[PDB]
Structure formats: C-alpha cells, structure tokens
Amino acid sequence: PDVDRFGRLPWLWITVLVFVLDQVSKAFFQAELSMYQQIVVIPDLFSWTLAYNTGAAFSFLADSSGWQRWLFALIAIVVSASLVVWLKRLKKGETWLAIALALVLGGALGNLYDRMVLGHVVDFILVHWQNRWYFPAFNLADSAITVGAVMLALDMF
Amino acid sequence: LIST
Ligand SMILES: CCCCCCCC/C=C\CCCCCCCC(=O)OC[C@H](O)CO
Ligand SMILES: CCCCCCCC/C=C\CCCCCCCC(=O)OC[C@H](O)CO
Ligand SMILES: CCCCCCCC/C=C\CCCCCCCC(=O)OC[C@H](O)CO
Ligand SMILES: CCCCCCCC/C=C\CCCCCCCC(=O)OC[C@H](O)CO
Numbered sequence: 001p002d003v004d005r006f007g008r009l010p011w012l013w014i015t016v017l018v019f020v021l022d023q024v025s026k027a028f029f030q031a032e033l034s035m036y037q038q039i040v041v042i043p044d045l046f047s048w049t050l051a052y053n054t055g056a057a058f059s060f061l062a063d064s065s066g067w068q069r070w071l072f073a074l075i076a077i078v079v080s081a082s083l084v085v086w087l088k089r090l091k092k093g094e095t096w097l098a099i100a101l102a103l104v105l106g107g108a109l110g111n112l113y114d115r116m117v118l119g120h121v122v123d124f125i126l127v128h129w130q131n132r133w134y135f136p137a138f139n140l141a142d143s144a145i146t147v148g149a150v151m152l153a154l155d156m157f
Numbered sequence: 158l159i160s161t
C-alpha cells in the first residue's frame with residue numbers, strides 16, 4: 001500500500017489541518033471584528049476578541065521593539081525543522097508521539113506565517129473571570145501547540 | 158512558537 005512508502009510523513013496532514021483551521025479562524029475574526037472589540041459568549045467567562053500580538057511579554061529583553069517578529073519566527077523555523085525530522089524517525093504504533101508532534105508543528109507554522117506575512121500574531125480567544133483577571137488572548141495555533149506540548153510532557157509518564 |  002501507500003502507507004508504507006511515505007513512512008510517518010502523512011501525519012503532516014494533521015499539521016496542515018491545524019494550520020488551515022488556524023488561518024480560517026484568524027481570517028474570520030480579522031473580518032468580523034475591530035481591534036480589542038469583544039463578542040460576548042459567556043458574559044462572566046468567555047468572549048471572542050481581536051488582538052495583535054507583537055510579543056510585549058518579552059519586551060524586557062531589549063530597548064528596541066519589533067525584533068520579536070524575527071527572533072520568534074527564527075525560533076519557529078528552527079524548531080519546526082527539528083520537529084519534522086523527529087517525526088520521520090518515528091515508528092508505526094507510536095501514534096501518540098506522531099499526533100503530538102503534528103499538533104505542535106501546525107501551531108508553530110500557523111503563528112510563523114503570521115509573524116512573516118503580518119507583523120504579528122492574530123489572537124481571538126478571550127477567557128476571563130468577570131473583571132477580576134483576564135487570560136492573555138490566544139488562538140487555535142496556541143491550542144494545538146499547548147495540547148501537543150502537554151501530550152509530549154505526559155509521555156515521560 | 159506561541160502568540161506571546
Ligand atoms: C492557505 C493555506 C495553505 C495550506 C495548504 C498546503 C497544502 C500542501 C499540500 C501538499 C504539499 C506538501 C504536503 C505536506 C504533507 C504531505 C503528507 C505526505 O507526505 O503524504 C503523502 C501521501 O499522500 C500520504 O497519503
Ligand atoms: C486545530 C484543530 C485540529 C485538530 C483536528 C484533529 C487532528 C487530527 C485528528 C485526527 C487525525 C485525522 C487523520 C489524519 C491522518 C493521520 C493518519 C496517518 O496518516 O498516519 C498513518 C502513517 O502512515 C503512520 O503509519
Ligand atoms: C478546534 C477545531 C474546531 C473548528 C476550527 C474552526 C473553528 C474556529 C473557532 C471559532 C470560529 C468559528 C466559530 C463561530 C463563532 C464566531 C461567530 C460570531 O459569533 O460572530 C457572529 C457575528 O459577528 C454577529 O455578532
Ligand atoms: C474542545 C475543542 C473545541 C473545538 C472548538 C469548536 C467549538 C466552537 C467553540 C464554541 C462554540 C460556541 C459558539 C458560540 C459563538 C457564537 C457567539 C454567540 O452566542 O452569538 C454572538 C452574538 O452575536 C452576540 O452574543
């Protein structure tokens with residue numbers, strides 16, 4: 001069959017699927033919302049939003065702004081490469097690792113595309129508790145990465 | 158990799 005000639009490569013269809021859903025997601029909320037506008041789903045807990053993440057969380061590392069676009073893109077590129085080879089070196093029946101890797105790769109490329117094409121990453125998911133605390137807005141790419149990362153972390157049993 |  002064809003499953004045997006491409007090895008572990010067809011797991012990248014999960015990566016593509018993640019990438020696409022991530023980009024359709026962002027495109028929608030770029031179209032439907034203005035910056036920081038929020039569509040309330042659960043008044044106290046959860047809302048859609050629109051935010052551009054130029055990465056101000058790591059602003060403490062430099063007297064310049066705008067470098068996160070390139071540094072983080074660079075890290076994405078580097079980590080993506082190493083993640084692909086490590087997907088290839090896998091065996092059939094290691095289905096847990098393949099999925100986890102594909103998820104992280106999809107999220108990595110999703111935000112990588114943003115930092116390169118746009119100047120920033122698009123964020124639309126706003127989870128919070130009333131006006132007591134707000135969780136930093138994220139997207140599907142982050143979710144794929146986070147779920148992917150946790151799956152890897154629970155692999156060390 | 159993530160947004161932030
Ligand atoms: C706007 C979003 C654009 C995103 C659209 C990208 C489409 C890329 C499709 C093919 C090129 C590379 C494919 C990479 C994954 C190939 C998996 C593979 O090797 O599988 C071969 C065989 O078909 C297993 O059944
Ligand atoms: C952003 C939300 C994205 C989450 C959406 C769910 C993600 C994937 C779920 C099911 C995988 C679908 C099947 C894709 C094909 C994987 C099976 C495969 O091709 O692996 C065989 C390989 O040859 C090894 O032997
Ligand atoms: C994880 C894989 C699941 C599928 C991945 C893609 C889904 C992306 C998530 C939300 C976007 C679509 C949800 C629709 C909710 C937004 C629509 C809305 O409320 O806007 C209406 C309009 O603005 C009047 O106010
Ligand atoms: C676990 C994996 C999850 C996969 C993710 C896919 C599920 C979609 C997420 C929420 C759906 C709820 C839809 C609520 C969005 C519509 C907002 C609404 O209620 O309407 C807005 C109105 O214009 C003003 O209130």
Ligand SMILES: CCCCCCCC/C=C\CCCCCCCC(=O)OC[C@H](O)CO
Pocket residue numbers: 015016019109110112113116117
């Ligand atoms: C699953 C599908 C695979 C997804 C693959 C991830 C996306 C590729 C990342 C960038 C592509 C575009 C290359 C951009 C070339 C860099 C130069 C640039 O972006 O400059 C823009 C502008 O000139 C400065 O303001």
Ligand SMILES: CCCCCCCC/C=C\CCCCCCCC(=O)OC[C@H](O)CO
Pocket residue numbers: 099136137138139142143144146147159160161
């Ligand atoms: C077979 C493949 C199955 C596919 C499985 C799909 C998993 C989706 C289920 C729950 C999503 C929970 C997502 C948790 C969101 C984490 C938020 C986050 O990562 O935030 C990022 C950062 O803080 C911002 O900059």
